[model samples]
Target: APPSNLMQLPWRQGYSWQPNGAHSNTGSGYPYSSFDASYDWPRWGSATYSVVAAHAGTVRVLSRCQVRVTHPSGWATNYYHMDQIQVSNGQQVSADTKLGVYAGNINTALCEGGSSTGPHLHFSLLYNGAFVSLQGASFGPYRINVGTSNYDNDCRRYYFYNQSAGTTHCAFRPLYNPGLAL
Candidate 1:
C-alpha cells in the first residue's frame, strides 16, 4: 500500500515560494508569506489544476467537476475543478485513480479569474469529514508538508512540492495502475 497521504499534482506549479525559482512570484501578494500560511488566492481562485485521490476510497459526492470520497485513513478527500468527472457517485476507486480530467477553466463561483491564474482546482484531504487546516492543525502529529517524491522528474513536478516542509513528495501514476504506483 502507498503512504496514507499520497496525492500527486496534475500540472506544473505556477506561483511558488522557492527562492530564485523560475515561477516564483509569491502569488499576487504576501498573503502566503509565511511557510505556515495557507495559500492566499483571490476569491474563488485555486492553485492546483487537477485533483487526485490521497488514498483508497469510495466516491460519495460528485457535482459538476468536484468530488468527495471516503478513504482508508478514516477520512474523505475533496477533489475540485475537474473538467470532467470519470466516476459516478458511490463508485469504488483506489489510490491515484483518475477521478476526472482537469479542465483549465474558471467556470464556477470558486474559480473565476485569469486563464493562467484562474481555472485551477481546489483540492482538500479531509480527515473524518473535516477539511485539514494548515493554520490550525498541529504540526508534528499532523504530518504537514509531505511532498511529492521521485515522481516529479518532469516539468509538472513543481506543482507537487511540499510547501510547508519545502520538499517534493507527490508523484504521477497511470490510470489503470492497480497497485497505484506513485
Candidate 2:
C-alpha cells in the first residue's frame, strides 16, 4: 500500500502547468507523457525553486532532467527537468527532502531522449508498472482535479489541472482536503 500521506507537491506554491507548450503537446507524438511546471512569472531556466520528494522513497537518478523515487507502496514518481540532485541513488528521502534545484530548460535535451523548450518539471507517476491518472489522488490536504479542456492531444490523455484561482497554467494543485488523506 502507498503511504497514508503519500507525498506533497514537489515544487513550492505559485507554480503552474504548461500543457499546451511545444514540449508537452500531443502533436509532438512522443512515447512518454509528462507535464512542464513553471511559476506565474516567466523565469524559464532559472533555479528559483527546489524540487522535493512527494513522499518518502528511495532515489534513482535517470539523467540530468529526470529522477525516479520508489515509494514503499510500490509506487514510483518520476521527477524530470531537475538539476543539482541532492539525494544519491538508494538514499532514503521524505516528502520534504530536497531533490534538486529547478533546471527546466538546461538539460531538457536529455529528458526522454528529446528536448524541451522551457523550464518545468515533467512529473509522471506509475503504480504496479502502469501509468495512472493523478485525478482524485490525494496530495497532502488537496485532491487532484482535471480542468476543463486540459487534454493532451498527442498522447490522448489529460494533464493534471491545478484548480488554484487566477492561474491559467495546467499543473497539479493541492489546496483542498478531500478527506482522502491518510
Candidate 3:
C-alpha cells in the first residue's frame, strides 16, 4: 500500500542504470538513511546533486537544511542537508521536479539543530509520524539493506541492493528507477 509500491530515490544521477543513493548507516547511508551524528559514519552527498521528489506529492520546507514530501499513501520522506532549497512550501512536486541542490552543506545551526560532520543529506523515512527502518526497503529499482545496529561500528549494517538488476553497493553502483514520477 506504501513504501515499496511507487517510491523512487529522492535524487538522480543522469543514468538509467546508475545508483544515485547509498545506504549510510546512522545517517550517512543514503537518501533513505538518517544522520544522527552520534556515530562515526562516513559522510555522503558530496559535490552537487539535484534533489527531486521520491514519489509525487506535496512538498514542505521544514528548515534551512530540511525538506519534506508527503506522499499520497501516508508516507513521508524527510530530506536534510540541502544547501539550496528551490521549491516553495506546499508546492506540488513530481519526479521531474527539482526540489533543491545538495552539496553536502553541514551546518548544525542551519539544519535547525542536529549533529553532523559535514555536507550530507540526513535523508530519513517515516510512516504515520513514526520512524521506520529502511532495511530491505525498495527505492526505485534498488533496495537499501541497512545494518541492524546503526550506531555500532562492528555491525554489517549498510549497503544498497539493486533487486531488479541483481546488484548491491559501496557508496553506490549503477542502477535506475523507471517510475519515479508515479
Candidate 4:
C-alpha cells in the first residue's frame, strides 16, 4: 500500500522503468484490478531482478514469492510470483524497500506451485481487504489507469515526466515501463 498520500513504483529507483511494467490483461485478468509486470528487455534486466515495495506498510507473506503490504489507509498492494523473498510477516516496509525479485515460473512444487516460462511480477491493489483498481493512484512520476478492455494497454502513462510506457501488451509480450526519472 503506497501511502494514501504518495505512491511508489514497485522497482528500485533510478532505473528506466521498462520491461513492460504496463497493464497486461488488466480489465479481464484473473484479478481484474491487477497487472502483470513483464521483464522483456535485457539491457538492464537480469536473471535475478529486484521487486521493490510500492508503498509503506505491514508485510505479509502470502506464498513462496507472494507478499502483501497493508498501508495505514487500509489500502494494500500485492506482489505475487516473486522469488528470494526477503521480508518477513509482520515486518514494516516503506516505498522502494526491496521485498524480493519478480520471479520466473519454475520449480512449481518448490516455488509453492504455479508454472511459468518467463519473468515478471503480478502486482495488484487492495482496499480494506478487497482487490481494487489504481484509477485514482499515482506512483512516483507515473500515474496508472486500468483500461476499459484487457486488450487495451498503456495503463502506465504519466506524460508530464515523459514517463510513458508505450503500447504495452498482455500475456508475456514486450511492454515498457520507462523512466521513473522523478
Candidate 5:
C-alpha cells in the first residue's frame, strides 16, 4: 500500500523527492543510496508550522539536528536539520504528532529545508534498505542516456556544487554523515 495517510506530505506541497513525477534535480536519477534515508523534513518559520510523524513508531534516531522514524517494515523515515526535536531516540510517537519546530539557516545544510532556496521539504523513498535505484524501466524513458539502455552505466555524476556554468546553485553533500545522526 501507499505510505500511510499521515506519511504523505501533510498539506499540498512540492519539490519532494518524487515531486512533479520526477526527481528533485531535474534529469537526475535517485538521490541517495537507500530508501530508509530517502526523506527530508520541512518546517517553515512560525508561519509555516512544524511537521509531524504520520504514524506510530520508534523514534529510531533523534538528535538536536535531525529525527528518524522506523516503522515495523524496516523502512526508516528521516527528517533532517531541524531547529528542535520534541521526541527522544526510542520514544514512541503517533500520526500527526509534533516532532519538532522549524529550524533556521544555522545548520540548514544538515537539515532538509534550511539551505534550500526556499522552505520546502525534500522527501524520498528507499527500497531494500537503500535508495530505490532511479534506473529501472519505469523512470528510464526520459533519462539522459550516454548510450546503453541503462543510464546507470554511462550517466554523468554531479555532486552538490555552489556554482553552475552560468547559474547560481547550492553546494550539497551527496551523502550525509552516518556519524552525524546514526
Candidate 6:
C-alpha cells in the first residue's frame, strides 16, 4: 500500500554526492554494478546522522557497513557505508525507523565497496535479482533525478522540498529504469 510515508533520501539536507567524486556513480559504475551515495564534509572523523529506512520493510544487517531492507513490494533497498547499525536482521521498520549512522569506512567485502574515500551512504534498489533505476521515484518529498546538471553535469541526483529551504538538490546514483530486470 504505497509506503507508510514518503521515504527521505537517507541523509540530512545540505549534504550532497557528486559525479566523478569518490564513490559516486560515475566513479563506481552505478547501475552497471551498484550505487554509491556519499557526503564529503570538510572535517575529520565521521559525521554522525541517522540513516532512515526508505520504506516499511524487514531489516537485514549484511555487515558492519551495510543494511538491507526487504519490502513487501517484491523489492529490496540496500544501504551501505553505515556504522553502529540500529536495526537487526528480520526486524520490522518503516520510513521513520533509524537504520544507523553514516560512519566507518566502506566495507570492501560488501557489495559496491572499495569506492568510498570518506563517510557516505551507498544506496541501491533491487527487484527479483537485478538492480533497477530509482529515477522519478519519490520518498517523502524527495524525488530522484537521473539527469540534472544542477548537481553534477546531469548526473543522477535528488531534489527534495524542504519546508525551510524550499527545493534543494543532492547527488544521487545513476540508473535508467527500463523495466524491473537486469
Task: Report the number of the highest-lDDT candidate.
Answer: 4
What value does the lDDT take at residue 179 in candidate 4?
24
lDDT of 6 by residue, 1-182 (tens): 12424444555433433322222323334442234454443233656556667666788887877788877776667777678887888999865577887774445323445544566566766665456655555544444455333123333333332333355554443322111111
Query: Poorest 10 consecutive residues of model 5 by lDDT?
Result: 173-182
What TM-score, over all chains together, does every model reach?
0.47, 0.66, 0.71, 0.71, 0.47, 0.64
User: In every candidate, how many clashes are there?
Assistant: 9, 4, 12, 7, 8, 3
Which portions of model 6 show Cα errors greater than 4 Å?
A: 1-6, 12-40, 105-113, 148-182
Q: Model 4: residues >4 Å from true position, as ranges?
A: 1-5, 19-31, 41-46, 108-117, 154-182
> CA lDDT of each candidate?
0.40, 0.55, 0.57, 0.61, 0.38, 0.53
**Backbone clashes counted, model 6:** 3
Candidate 5 local lDDT, 1-182, one digit each (tens): 22323243321223122121214222245453211111242343323335466345677544565666666765555555444567887788764567764454445535433344334333333433454433221111112112222112222342211111222211221221111100
lDDT per residue for candidate 2 within 46-143, as digits (tens), equals 55456777777789887766688887677877777677777888898877677886674554535555555566566766675555555555455544
lDDT of 6 at 129: 43
Question: What would the per-residue lDDT of candidate 4 be over residues 1-182, giving only the tens digit for each residue?
Answer: 34333566677766533433333323345434566564453322357568888877899998876889898889888887788889999999888889988764455212655544456676777888888655545565544554555434443442213234443233334323332334
For model 1, how big is the CA root-mean-square deviation? 10.7
Candidate 3: tens digits of C-alpha lDDT, residues 104-182: 5455324566465444455667676555666666676666665544432222455656666676553433334455422
Q: Which wins on lDDT, candidate 1 or candidate 4?
A: 4
On residues 1-182, what C-alpha lDDT tens digit does candidate 1 reach at each position? 22423433222223121111111112233212112111233334345333445456788655666677786666565655565676877788765566664444467423433233334344454667665432222211122222123111243422233334554322221111122222
Candidate 5, which segments miss by more than 4 Å at Cα? 1-6, 10-28, 31-48, 106-115, 133-182
Model 3 residue 89 CA deviation (Å) reads 1.8
lDDT of 6: 0.53
